Amino acid sequence: SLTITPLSPALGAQISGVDISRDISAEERDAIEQALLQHQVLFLRDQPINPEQQARFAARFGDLHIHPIYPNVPDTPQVLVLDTAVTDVRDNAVWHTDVTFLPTPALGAVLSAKQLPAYGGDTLWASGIAAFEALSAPLREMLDGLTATHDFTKSFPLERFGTTPQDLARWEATRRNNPPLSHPVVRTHPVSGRKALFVNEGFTTRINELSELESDALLRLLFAHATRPEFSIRWRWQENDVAFWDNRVTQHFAVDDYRPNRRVMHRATILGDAPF
Amino acid sequence: SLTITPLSPALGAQISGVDISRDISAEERDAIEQALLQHQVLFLRDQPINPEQQARFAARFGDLHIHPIYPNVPDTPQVLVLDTAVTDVRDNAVWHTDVTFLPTPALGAVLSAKQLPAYGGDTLWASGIAAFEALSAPLREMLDGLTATHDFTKSFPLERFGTTPQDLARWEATRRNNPPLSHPVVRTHPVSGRKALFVNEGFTTRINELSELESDALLRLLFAHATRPEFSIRWRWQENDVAFWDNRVTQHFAVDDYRPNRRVMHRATILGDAPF
Amino acid sequence: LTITPLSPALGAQISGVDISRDISAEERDAIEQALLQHQVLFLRDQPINPEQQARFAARFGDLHIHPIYPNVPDTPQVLVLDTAVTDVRDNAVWHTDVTFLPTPALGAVLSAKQLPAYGGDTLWASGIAAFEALSAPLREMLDGLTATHDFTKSFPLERFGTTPQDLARWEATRRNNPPLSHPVVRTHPVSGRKALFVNEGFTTRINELSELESDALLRLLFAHATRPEFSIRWRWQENDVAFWDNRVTQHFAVDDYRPNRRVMHRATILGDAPF
Amino acid sequence: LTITPLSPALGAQISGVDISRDISAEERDAIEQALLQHQVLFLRDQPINPEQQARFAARFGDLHIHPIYPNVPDTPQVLVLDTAVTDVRDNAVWHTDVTFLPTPALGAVLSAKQLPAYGGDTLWASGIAAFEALSAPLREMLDGLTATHDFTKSFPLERFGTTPQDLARWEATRRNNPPLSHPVVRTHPVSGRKALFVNEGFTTRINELSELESDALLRLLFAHATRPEFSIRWRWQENDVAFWDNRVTQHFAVDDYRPNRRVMHRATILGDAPF
């Protein structure tokens, strides 16, 4: 009755037969967690939910993160209201792993679909575990143990189509407050111990132990490699979908093909520890 | 009642409310035809057909191709049987457009899913139309009028046919029969008039009017550009699925992650005219 | 006056004249005509002092008096580079001088005062030869496009900031020099010759292309424009004079002599707006 | 015997020994040592005839003889390279000589006879200097890997001709020199210095990497190994002699002089199996 149906060999699974708007049992919570450990990104369909519920469900998997930036519902502040009619989304022209420019990148996130365009707006996910596993032996050896700079500043969109309000000052603010830092290039999953590539085009600027030119060659290699179809899935949203993914060993990509159409999601972020 | 449900803005639509295991009505045929010209790749689920039903259907959209060299159904040799027990699948391991090395590459294909692995073996399509429209104007202006060389051997080197001196002669004949030839880089669809990128990593070796070095840069750019998520869809197959796509303005990619699991598809191929 | 070509693509050595003293109106014209043809001119065994250097450089254009570096007192018109005083982390990438300016230097006169035994070659490349070697369709696309030149490509300080004492001058030049644009294909204001006018040092973006398209084209242009066919390489020797047109060339200072020391005087000649 | 280094990476001008003579064991030893340090050696104003050039080249190994090429009648040990008789191309990609062979040439001795007034420079690049400049993680990964070298990378089918007598000579050479492998990091058989041993001319694949990875890596190595820091550019004059070590270098013939006549004489010294 609780059911896990894999979307592909590399990553992703749909879950059915457990109502996450209610309090879930420890057997359920565990099975879900094992699922997440295995398939890295998890989808539940036909699972309508509210902030309180969303917050409670997410909390069962890590301590939640209530933040200043972005929208927050009036009742629960630990659920962001991402709304097209308001905010903007030019932060996703490239593959991302979330907040890798933090010492302490999020463990993952739980995201519910509220209002969707007729179509468009897919999200892709890629597995750092599958992608790594597929590199040549010599290359896994060279990379495992190297480190990489992740830097918020790489997120700078500014005037591409010039949506940015005179307040590009929020952006400047976040910059001055989050200095570049480093994470392993090959990461070991804190819980499963499985190894994943942990560089993403969103924030990774440099492999520290290689020279600029080598770094640039290698990252160009690794960005294209990590995001090949073999290591990714593509989700077409439906309303009342819930996506639950492990941000420690995946990237994702929001396809921008639906503007000006309105899109409303609710996100709950689960705090993560130190990548190693 | 025949419904057409867009799968993504760039391309793709799912069709239902039509029974293609029988002979379809002028009206239906027409709506599908339009749907093809609009959405470029079409899908039907739960639409089991035998070789003959599949041939009757495909023939409603152009002349068929009886290839008398691969494993086809003896009774209706218009339908080719692609079984992983018997035949292999090396061909779809890279983004390609079907047989562009022919002066008259295939118009399109009808594909029917027999037996499948639980999951894995997705196929991706990409729109030459949407990719082209997405290039900036100066790049469109330069490429529109350039030609490119397509070469059968690029996807089928000597190593493909085998080691035997028998496979060698076989192969050297096929090559003698298909010298490298040229097509427009930007193809005008002969029915819709919509312009499309018409290079593919599977067979395009060279942009003719550019230097090797310039060509290499441009094709590496175009290949990446044209297979971006914004220009593609990804189909997860189920038994009795049917895919019908226009091979004049698309590309496709068969994810290789099911081996050794067995996979059987029936394909009928509709003959095309000279790209311009 | 003798003029002796060094490569089909660019560069010529000069002799039969002495430039430590004013030159005839015929000699100067002959030189300007050499500079316009050969793009970079060299003079061996031509000892000179800031005063004469200035006098010579000035007969080819208006001279510059800053330029964010240590200069000789008697002649503010002559910059003194000394690897003991001033490092050179900005010369070992191909660049065209001050393209981040609204109006980059016409070119410079450079004198060899003190040099290591060997090492520290300087390479020069021609945007005229480079451009003419591109295919017709590619010249047609590029000709008319523009590119962003950003002072902070050839620096970012090695991210030496946070450090404040010596870096405040960096964010100053940065604030004083926002990224601006130049045509990708420049028409030489005298000769009418067309040249590639992008350089890896400062050029960050082709404005009219997307970022991915720009990135591809720039990788291609940066490699193409510095192939052997379009460049020359000068082994320096004390008392040398290099005089180059910075409107249609790039140059590269090989960094292979550290920790050896090296001293040279520059007169930069002010330029006009690229088109 | 005087050895004047041209750059820290490689290259030295030699004098105090007339190599058109029968030289001493001692002078021959000093030359070999200079070659082992500098990788490429140059003599100016060294007229030499084919008999002498061979007698000199043989002092450093066995020599390659005659066919099916244009050697001087009495001297099958010296190849005569004339533009008037034989057209030359794709010496215009960077390459190491005959790396597709099991035992690529040790090196060559090259004499300049008749030169264009200018153009026709040759660049050399040090694979030792270039290896040492790679980051440790890269050196550690590359050192032990092997790569495929393939005659047909630079001599594709179309360089022979649609003529049936050309496809018989090329299929046989393609069958006579099928692709094979050398170490990516070569250990000089005499000095033990380690060097990158790939080159754009012949190297197709890093075997223990995937195609995709090989592609990105070779593209890095090719650009890197030919940077200005690890190369020199020789401007030829008549009666120059260049003598290079093909075990650890790459070279490039700028093609910018045609249709002007260039006549060179080359003796090739036979090499052994790279490890």
PDB file of C-alpha atoms in Angstrom, chain D residues 99-180:
ATOM      1  CA  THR D  99      54.534   9.481 -33.111  1.00  0.00           C
ATOM      2  CA  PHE D 100      52.204   6.967 -34.811  1.00  0.00           C
ATOM      3  CA  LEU D 101      55.258   4.756 -35.273  1.00  0.00           C
ATOM      4  CA  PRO D 102      56.205   2.296 -32.504  1.00  0.00           C
ATOM      5  CA  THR D 103      59.555   4.075 -32.299  1.00  0.00           C
ATOM      6  CA  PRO D 104      59.200   7.787 -33.167  1.00  0.00           C
ATOM      7  CA  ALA D 105      62.251   9.713 -34.300  1.00  0.00           C
ATOM      8  CA  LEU D 106      64.843  10.676 -31.719  1.00  0.00           C
ATOM      9  CA  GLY D 107      65.203  13.980 -33.505  1.00  0.00           C
ATOM     10  CA  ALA D 108      66.338  15.670 -36.640  1.00  0.00           C
ATOM     11  CA  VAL D 109      69.072  17.945 -37.963  1.00  0.00           C
ATOM     12  CA  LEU D 110      67.796  20.630 -40.312  1.00  0.00           C
ATOM     13  CA  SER D 111      69.788  22.929 -42.600  1.00  0.00           C
ATOM     14  CA  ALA D 112      68.500  26.170 -44.128  1.00  0.00           C
ATOM     15  CA  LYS D 113      69.629  26.611 -47.747  1.00  0.00           C
ATOM     16  CA  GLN D 114      67.418  29.105 -49.519  1.00  0.00           C
ATOM     17  CA  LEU D 115      64.837  31.136 -47.647  1.00  0.00           C
ATOM     18  CA  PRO D 116      62.037  33.541 -48.518  1.00  0.00           C
ATOM     19  CA  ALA D 117      62.933  37.134 -47.570  1.00  0.00           C
ATOM     20  CA  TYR D 118      60.698  36.510 -44.563  1.00  0.00           C
ATOM     21  CA  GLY D 119      58.057  34.139 -43.185  1.00  0.00           C
ATOM     22  CA  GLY D 120      58.466  30.396 -42.586  1.00  0.00           C
ATOM     23  CA  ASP D 121      59.270  30.553 -38.862  1.00  0.00           C
ATOM     24  CA  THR D 122      59.314  27.333 -36.857  1.00  0.00           C
ATOM     25  CA  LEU D 123      58.147  27.114 -33.254  1.00  0.00           C
ATOM     26  CA  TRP D 124      59.209  24.401 -30.833  1.00  0.00           C
ATOM     27  CA  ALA D 125      57.501  23.543 -27.588  1.00  0.00           C
ATOM     28  CA  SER D 126      58.952  21.799 -24.576  1.00  0.00           C
ATOM     29  CA  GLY D 127      56.897  18.853 -23.327  1.00  0.00           C
ATOM     30  CA  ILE D 128      59.064  18.769 -20.202  1.00  0.00           C
ATOM     31  CA  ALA D 129      58.401  22.360 -19.241  1.00  0.00           C
ATOM     32  CA  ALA D 130      54.730  21.900 -20.013  1.00  0.00           C
ATOM     33  CA  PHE D 131      54.396  18.791 -17.884  1.00  0.00           C
ATOM     34  CA  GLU D 132      56.015  20.499 -14.915  1.00  0.00           C
ATOM     35  CA  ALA D 133      53.571  23.415 -15.098  1.00  0.00           C
ATOM     36  CA  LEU D 134      50.506  21.209 -14.677  1.00  0.00           C
ATOM     37  CA  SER D 135      49.037  21.102 -11.174  1.00  0.00           C
ATOM     38  CA  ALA D 136      50.037  18.123  -9.062  1.00  0.00           C
ATOM     39  CA  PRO D 137      46.590  16.469  -9.241  1.00  0.00           C
ATOM     40  CA  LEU D 138      46.753  16.603 -13.045  1.00  0.00           C
ATOM     41  CA  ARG D 139      50.328  15.344 -13.254  1.00  0.00           C
ATOM     42  CA  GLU D 140      49.471  12.513 -10.922  1.00  0.00           C
ATOM     43  CA  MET D 141      46.468  11.463 -13.064  1.00  0.00           C
ATOM     44  CA  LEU D 142      48.162  11.780 -16.468  1.00  0.00           C
ATOM     45  CA  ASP D 143      51.352  10.037 -15.451  1.00  0.00           C
ATOM     46  CA  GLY D 144      50.658   6.408 -16.351  1.00  0.00           C
ATOM     47  CA  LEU D 145      47.807   6.947 -18.783  1.00  0.00           C
ATOM     48  CA  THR D 146      48.265   5.950 -22.421  1.00  0.00           C
ATOM     49  CA  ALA D 147      47.162   7.549 -25.680  1.00  0.00           C
ATOM     50  CA  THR D 148      46.456   6.410 -29.223  1.00  0.00           C
ATOM     51  CA  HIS D 149      48.483   7.956 -32.061  1.00  0.00           C
ATOM     52  CA  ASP D 150      47.113   7.610 -35.555  1.00  0.00           C
ATOM     53  CA  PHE D 151      48.816   8.462 -38.835  1.00  0.00           C
ATOM     54  CA  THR D 152      45.455   9.270 -40.366  1.00  0.00           C
ATOM     55  CA  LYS D 153      44.608  12.025 -37.916  1.00  0.00           C
ATOM     56  CA  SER D 154      46.778  14.407 -39.915  1.00  0.00           C
ATOM     57  CA  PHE D 155      46.974  12.401 -43.141  1.00  0.00           C
ATOM     58  CA  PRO D 156      43.266  11.717 -43.621  1.00  0.00           C
ATOM     59  CA  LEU D 157      42.157  10.005 -46.844  1.00  0.00           C
ATOM     60  CA  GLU D 158      41.692  13.309 -48.701  1.00  0.00           C
ATOM     61  CA  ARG D 159      45.382  14.237 -48.480  1.00  0.00           C
ATOM     62  CA  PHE D 160      46.232  11.375 -50.857  1.00  0.00           C
ATOM     63  CA  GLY D 161      43.716  11.820 -53.707  1.00  0.00           C
ATOM     64  CA  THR D 162      40.614  10.340 -55.390  1.00  0.00           C
ATOM     65  CA  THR D 163      43.127   8.588 -57.653  1.00  0.00           C
ATOM     66  CA  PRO D 164      43.115   4.760 -57.252  1.00  0.00           C
ATOM     67  CA  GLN D 165      46.944   4.665 -57.041  1.00  0.00           C
ATOM     68  CA  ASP D 166      46.718   6.928 -53.984  1.00  0.00           C
ATOM     69  CA  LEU D 167      44.082   4.845 -52.169  1.00  0.00           C
ATOM     70  CA  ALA D 168      46.332   1.801 -52.660  1.00  0.00           C
ATOM     71  CA  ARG D 169      49.322   3.600 -51.137  1.00  0.00           C
ATOM     72  CA  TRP D 170      47.223   4.977 -48.274  1.00  0.00           C
ATOM     73  CA  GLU D 171      45.326   1.777 -47.447  1.00  0.00           C
ATOM     74  CA  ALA D 172      48.668  -0.008 -47.275  1.00  0.00           C
ATOM     75  CA  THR D 173      50.174   2.703 -45.073  1.00  0.00           C
ATOM     76  CA  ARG D 174      46.947   2.650 -43.081  1.00  0.00           C
ATOM     77  CA  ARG D 175      47.481  -1.104 -42.876  1.00  0.00           C
ATOM     78  CA  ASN D 176      51.231  -0.595 -42.357  1.00  0.00           C
ATOM     79  CA  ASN D 177      50.640   1.932 -39.596  1.00  0.00           C
ATOM     80  CA  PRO D 178      47.411   1.074 -37.822  1.00  0.00           C
ATOM     81  CA  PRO D 179      46.848   3.120 -34.667  1.00  0.00           C
ATOM     82  CA  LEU D 180      48.969   2.308 -31.618  1.00  0.00           C
TER      83      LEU D 180
END
